[PDB]
Amino acid sequence: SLIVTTILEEPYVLFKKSDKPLYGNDRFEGYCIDLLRELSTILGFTYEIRLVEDGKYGAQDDVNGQWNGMVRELIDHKADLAVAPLAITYVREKVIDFSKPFMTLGISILYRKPNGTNPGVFSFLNPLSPDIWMYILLAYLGVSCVLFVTRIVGGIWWFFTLIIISSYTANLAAFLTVERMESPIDSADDLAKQTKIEYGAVEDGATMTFFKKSKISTYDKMWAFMSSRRQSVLVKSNEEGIQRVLTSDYAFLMESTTIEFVTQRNCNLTQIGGLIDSKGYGVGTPMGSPYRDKITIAILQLQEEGKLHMMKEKWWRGNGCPEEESKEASALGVQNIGGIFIVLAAGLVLSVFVAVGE
Amino acid sequence: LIVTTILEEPYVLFKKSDKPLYGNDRFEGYCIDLLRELSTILGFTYEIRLVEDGKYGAQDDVNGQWNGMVRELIDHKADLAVAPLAITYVREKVIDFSKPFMTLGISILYRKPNGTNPGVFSFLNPLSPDIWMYILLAYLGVSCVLFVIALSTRIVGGIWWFFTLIIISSYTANLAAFLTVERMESPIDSADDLAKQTKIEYGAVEDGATMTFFKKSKISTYDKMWAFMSSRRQSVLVKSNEEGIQRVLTSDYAFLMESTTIEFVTQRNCNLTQIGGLIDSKGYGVGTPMGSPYRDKITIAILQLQEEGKLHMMKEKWWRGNGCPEEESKEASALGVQNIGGIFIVLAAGLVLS
Amino acid sequence: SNRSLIVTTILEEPYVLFKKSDKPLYGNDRFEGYCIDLLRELSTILGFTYEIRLVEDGKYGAQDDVNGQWNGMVRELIDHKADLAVAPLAITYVREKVIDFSKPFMTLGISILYRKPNGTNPGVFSFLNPLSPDIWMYILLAYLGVSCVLFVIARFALSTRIVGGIWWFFTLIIISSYTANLAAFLTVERMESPIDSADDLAKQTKIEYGAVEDGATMTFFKKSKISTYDKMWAFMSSRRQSVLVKSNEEGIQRVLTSDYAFLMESTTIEFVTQRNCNLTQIGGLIDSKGYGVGTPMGSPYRDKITIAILQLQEEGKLHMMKEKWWRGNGCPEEESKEASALGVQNIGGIFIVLAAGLVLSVF
Amino acid sequence: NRSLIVTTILEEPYVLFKKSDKPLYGNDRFEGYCIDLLRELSTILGFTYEIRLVEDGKYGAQDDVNGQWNGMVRELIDHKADLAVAPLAITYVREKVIDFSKPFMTLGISILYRKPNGTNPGVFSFLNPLSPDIWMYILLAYLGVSCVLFVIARFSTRIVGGIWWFFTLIIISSYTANLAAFLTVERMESPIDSADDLAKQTKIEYGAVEDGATMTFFKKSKISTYDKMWAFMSSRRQSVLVKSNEEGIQRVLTSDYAFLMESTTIEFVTQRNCNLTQIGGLIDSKGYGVGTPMGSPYRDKITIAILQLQEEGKLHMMKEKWWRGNGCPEEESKEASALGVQNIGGIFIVLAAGLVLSVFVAVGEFL
Ligand SMILES: *[C@@H]1O[C@H](CO)[C@@H](O)[C@H](O)[C@H]1NC(C)=O
Ligand SMILES: *[C@@H]1O[C@H](CO)[C@@H](O)[C@H](O)[C@H]1NC(C)=O
Ligand SMILES: *[C@@H]1O[C@H](CO)[C@@H](O)[C@H](O)[C@H]1NC(C)=O
Ligand SMILES: *[C@@H]1O[C@H](CO)[C@@H](O)[C@H](O)[C@H]1NC(C)=O
Ligand SMILES: *[C@@H]1O[C@H](CO)[C@@H](O)[C@H](O)[C@H]1NC(C)=O
Ligand SMILES: *[C@@H]1O[C@H](CO)[C@@H](O)[C@H](O)[C@H]1NC(C)=O
DSSP states (O other): OOEEEEOOBTTTBEEOOOSSOOOSTTTEEOHHHHHHHHHHHHTTOOOEEEEOSSOOOOBOOTTTSSOBSTTTTTTTOOOSEEOSOOBOOHHHHHHSOOOSOSEEEOEEEEEEOOOOOOOOSOOTTSSBOHHHHHHHHHHHHHHHHHHHOOHHHHHHHHHHHHHHHHHHHHHHHHHHHHHHHSOSSOSTTOOTTTOSSEEEEBTTSHHHHHHHTOOOTTHHHHHHHHHHTHHHHOBSSHHHHHHHHHHSSEEEEEEHHHHHHHHHHOTTEEEOSOOOSOEEEOOBOSSOOTHHHHHHHHHHHHHSSSOHHHHHHHHHOOSOOOOOOSSOOSSBOHHHHHHHHHHHHHHHHHHHHHHHHO | OOEEOOOOTTTOOOOOOSSOOSSSSOOOSHHHHHHHHHHHHHTOOOOEEOOOSOSSOOOBTTTTBOOTTTTTTTSSSSSOBOOOOOOOHHHHTTSOOOSOSSEEOEEEEEEOOOOOOOSSSSSSSSBOHHHHHHHHHHHHHHHHHHHHHOOHHHHHHHHHHHHHHHHHHHHHHHHHHHHHHHHHSOSSOOTTHHHHOSSSEEEOBTTSSSHHHHHSSOOHHHHHHHHHHHHOTTTSOBSOSTTHHHHHHTSSEEEEEEHHHHHHHHHHOTTEEEEOOOSSOEEOOOBOOTTOTTHHHHHHHHHHHHHHTHHHHHHHHHHHGGGOOOSOSSOOOOSSBOSOOHHHHHHHHHHHHO | OOSOEEEOOOOBTTTBEEOOOSSOOOGGGGEESHHHHHHHHHHHHTTOOEEEOOOSSOSOOOOBTTTTBOOHHHHHHHTTTOSBOEESOOOOHHHHHHSEEOOOSSOOOEEEEEEOOOOSOOOTBGGGSSBOHHHHHHHHHHHHHHHHHHHHHHHOOHHHHHHHHHHHHHHHHHHHHHHHHHHHHHHHHHHSOOOOSHHHHHHOSSSBOOOBSSSTTTHHHHHOOSHHHHHHHHHHHHTTTTSSBSSHHHHHHHHHHSSBOEEEEHHHHHHHHHHSSSEEEOSOOSOOOOOEEEEOTTOTHHHHHHHHHHHHHHHTHHHHHHHHHHTSTTSTTOOOOOSOSSOOTTSBOHHHHHHHHHHHHHO | OOOEEEEEOOOTTTOEEOSOOSSOOSGGGEESHHHHHHHHHHHHSOOOEEEEEOTTSOOOOEETTTTEEOSTTHHHHTTSOSBOOSBOOOOHHHHTTEEEOOOSSBOOEEEEEEOOOSOOOSHHHHHTTSOHHHHHHHHHHHHHHHHHHHHHHHOOOSHHHHHHHHHHHHHHHHHHHHHHHHHHHOOOOOSOOSHHHHHHOOSSOBOEETTSHHHHHHTTOOOTTTHHHHHHHHHTTTTTEESSSHHHHHHHHHSSOEEEEEHHHHHHHHHHOTTEEEESSOSOOOBOBOEEETTOTTHHHHHHHHHHHHHHTHHHHHHHHTTOSSOOOOOOOOOOOOBOTTTSOHHHHHHHHHHHHHHHHHHHHTO
16 A cells, blocks of 8 residues: 655666566566665555656746646655656645655766876877987088097087987976866866857756855856757767767766766766765655654664675675776876887897897 | 848858849848758748848947847848857847757867977076076086185085075975966966956957846856956957957957857968857847747757758858868977077087097 | 953953963953953053953854844844954954944955965985986996997097097087086976966966855855956856865965965965965955944044054054064064075085095095 | 034145146045045934135144144144044043044054065075075085095996986986076065064164154154164164155155055055055054043044944045055066076176185185
8 A cells, every 4th residue: 555656767677678578576586675675574554656747857836836747646646756857946845745765865966977088108208209219310410420530519409409318308397387287077066167168968957956055166157168058968868978078078967876887887977076065866755644754763773784795785786897997197108108129229239139139 | 921131241241243232142140041051941932132231230229229130121121031140138038039059159269289398498597697697607616716725625615505495495486386377277267267367358249148148147257357458458459359369369368259250260361269158048040920820940940950950061061171181180289398408518518529 | 440341252362362371360460462462452541440251152243134133243242241342353244333443453355375386495315306317327327338448449549539539529419418408497486476476376277276265265256247357256156066175274285285265354365375385365455344343323432443543554553563464473483485586495405526526536 | 504614634645735736625525434524424414514624634643842732633632623633642641631433533653654566686696596505415415425425536437327316317407497586476475574583683774753753653662672672763764764765765665675654545545556555464453533622422432433434334445445545556477587796796706706716715725
């Protein structure tokens, strides 16, 4: 008799194909309903899973007063228990006394993973153009042959070496300084004062609503940019935004749980900052029925022992991810400077060969 | 039926002819071609009337009023008006517009990057010429002292080593500072580069729908640009574009103005380049009173033209005919030092001295 | 003249505290501090026979709109149990309407406490940062190999010229790479600057900054009409319960243990900075609310105290009293504040390495 | 309520005649922070006000010849002026004669000093990027290397050479990098940072206004940091002291100077002139306030009005309104400057010293 409303969400409620179609609750398989099954094994009761016909989320309507979404399946209290991805908003808390949230999270920014631009083993050749290097070699041969056939030539050679050292060091220092000045990522959670890396969120979603009703010095300018180019940055759904991020320089703003889910599904995306908003996901009941307190105490007794961590991991691992740097220093790498080692070894071995040849 | 056009230079001029003309089939331009194509495809015959009063649309926002070019040639004087203008709140509240035909946006005029690479440009640059003479005479003095002498050799070698270490460190450090200074500044200033810098000046037509977009729509970089423009109301602001092109032609100026005519200017004058792409979005259309008597025919014609593709080719040909040559084709600047040959020429001089 | 003057005070560490003595002590002798010194100066200027009577409510005056009743020092002043409430007690309109104050014996305001910018200065091996340790081992083995091959060639002059040239080129590349990397490392440090204003801290979002959950150091922001302060109040309101700590000491702990920039009255800020390092007052002064001495409305003492306070301001002994009670204890903990803008004092401890190489080369 | 007549000084940042003086003759004659403060007071408290300048254009100063007063306190004590809304500094000598409302603004002594620009001494131009201890350590290491080489000659063929090469390349790289960072960033800093820093030095002469608030405060200061300042000022009573204020500003603009002013006019000048800047924060903590005759009932309400203005933020609004006249022009876009003679000059002197030392020891060797 305990009807539980559900909504199909990629990391929360899934309709597994399995081998053959099933009927009832066994066909449905997802993190939320699995947690409900466990707490039903703990707290003794039955539950019947019911989906929402409309499939939309619950929010205040501009010209109706009544709310569409699960609220349509909640206005007449036809859903005894409501588990779904539901941010605890002001109006939702006003009308539903939501239990303690399962998760605490907020909107977070998503970005394409900054690939390491490897310039090859011969990276030390960059500061001076190769033509200048050929000039250096021809000058070396010229000064050597002139010396073969002494104060003036020695002084001019020393001055030339002076100039070459100075120029090479100046170019390399300028290149490394401009590389280090700009951060490999954008201004973390501070895409203001940038106006070049286009950023956007879902169209008229929870993130869009939050940015609309925000007055912080960074987020108000972010919302101004949102509204200025709404037809471009805003996307219909999460997958379209992810595809746009993959195909072009685009920063998305999505729920943090979805950000970690996606960035763990594939390692081509990263979460720059995180928790730039305060909200939570937890179940509730439209009426002040006494069993929501039982739900809260079930949540507390489930959290007092370690069981939700493992299910959260096994649900949000997906495939593996290659190791990535966390505290790499500013020191030159082997891949960045190994060219001089290689050329020195080659020069040494050819010198030995031509010495033993005669 | 009755239509109204605009007097702006980029879309139409006053074509010279002996026949008495007042704006009926005796002009030229892309707007004239658009109007004639619409009339022919829709079969509409009428008279075309020029601008009576107002430039770009007179605005009287002191009491929410607007008279010139907007309420004297669009609403009541003429039933319709194909006047090329942007769509904004003050117009679209009552004067409706068709779906956009071209997307208008402001981009930046800039000086074309010219590469000056003197042979002796950085060989004697970081060190002052007086310092160059000083180090030459110091070398001469230490050489003559060594000649006079030939222990003191250890101390003279040590002081020479200390001096040469300092002079190399100073020279290399100053060259690195110069390179860093010239490299931190963007090789081409973009929609965000101008805001963060102050050496390069930017401006546009005073309240010519450009800084109207800047006063509202508070974007961080855009707010910084608007503050900088308001700081210098004349120093960084130019009165129009007909002389703004000449101003930006030889100066450090940047001129913010719409994409179509900046493309026209860059094509007709390759000496100036365009940067930034559609940083703001604005659409074209036609004037329309309350009721839209002839919206159906114009919408049908423009959607048929969009599905036809004739607009794309007419746009390309008309806006490229003045710019058939393209001087800028493979613009690219090397990051490393190029043609720094002063050290090579002095090495050659030293070699031939012997 | 022959009447005891009852005064009240609260336990604020910089201002008034119980005298540090294991032996029990009673009366005015048991209280000591800056405000106690001020009261002693007032007593020795005017004619006072004063006894300190600690406020039982343990709070400052607050207009309780539930019943329209005061509390703490202000309410204690309304009924003349004590007629001189000398204490850290801000001059506010809600108080000044109901109670009567003298001139501000010191002016303060809201200011931001921020942890000093940590730098990678410590470490005698900081000169080896630009080149990775594996690269250093590669350099050492290349030096050993080139020495060995040169010795072999000598044992066994075009080849000598070639090996000399290749070694010179290798040294050229390695020294230029090291110089360039260390120059970039020391240039990006001077390139970035810490925030030293309220505008800079309000524009940013990474560095959290919030006031205390009960004091008036946030109530100014709530009623503030200035753009930047209103924006930062909106920011800290959007992230309440996380950047609005309950008490000052846990705010200091959070600042020490996190990228948190606390925000409270300037006197406490400078007291903390002099007493404890690692923290500085980055902002100058946001608000301005001087303290004062309590006084019942129908009491001439205020006026006289007014004059007395001004007397001290003319004598300059208020300045030295504040220095003694604020900076005097911080003298042992005075920060180095080196005048050298380079900040390169023994960054690279290569002298020790050179000495070790020399003594090993002595053989 | 009759009409309260206020007496006001003509201090520049606080009270100015209206720019259109020819057609204005009413209460709109005067404009300034004090004037619109009084306007806000009339908006918040019901009373009409008539502005009158003090006759002699002076502040209230005690006249010791007969015990009388000098300026606008004279008509306060005689009830000739109901209010004195003006920059009346709250002082003990005045408070015994008149009643001051609680300060609407707090000020004090501060150092006006020229904004640093491109300049650098000779030897310290290149000695700066390394600490003098590091230079002495380098010299000691060079001497040690020389004596170790002498011992080796008298008794490592290449090990000492290699370690010395490593040491010298590390030192040259560090020096080059540090001076490159200095040239790229160019983080200018004033020689003085606080009062004690200016007290210790003697190259930059001080400044004040003779028979002014600053000089009187410095006299009889008895503070260990300001008694030396008073002694230095007494050393040259004609040079460092300035008979006026604009004269002192011009002097500090046109020459090396460390003038001393009230913080309000300090910030007014620094926001009006980019060449100048403020040092020391606050030395004294003098407060302003409106003046009233003793026993005037309006003090207890005008202090309430001032506290309201300060709490609601309108005081800060009118403060920021008429002290940022144009803002600070910051460009930071000029750094392509070569090493001139001034930028690096000490190297010629040190090499000449080395040369003369070498020739002296050479001619002494023949002995
Ligand atoms: C790799 O990084 C570069 C540098 O920003 C940029 O082109 C882009 O983010 C990546 N390029 C790819 C994935 O082709
Ligand atoms: C080269 O470009 C610069 C930058 O505007 C300027 O000196 C000038 O426009 C050009 N110099 C010429 C044409 O000699
Ligand atoms: C040192 O720097 C680190 C940088 O991550 C930061 O924890 C803080 O600024 C400093 N911490 C301590 C304990 O000094
Ligand atoms: C400052 O931070 C350091 C680093 O954690 C710590 O050791 C020290 O106790 C702190 N306080 C000081 C130096 O007063
Ligand atoms: C730079 O400062 C010196 C300080 O003596 C001053 O004489 C000179 O006029 C200043 N130059 C400027 C501000 O251009
Ligand atoms: C003073 O005026 C401006 C403000 O900084 C400055 O550019 C100028 O060089 C200065 N001139 C003198 C003589 O100090």
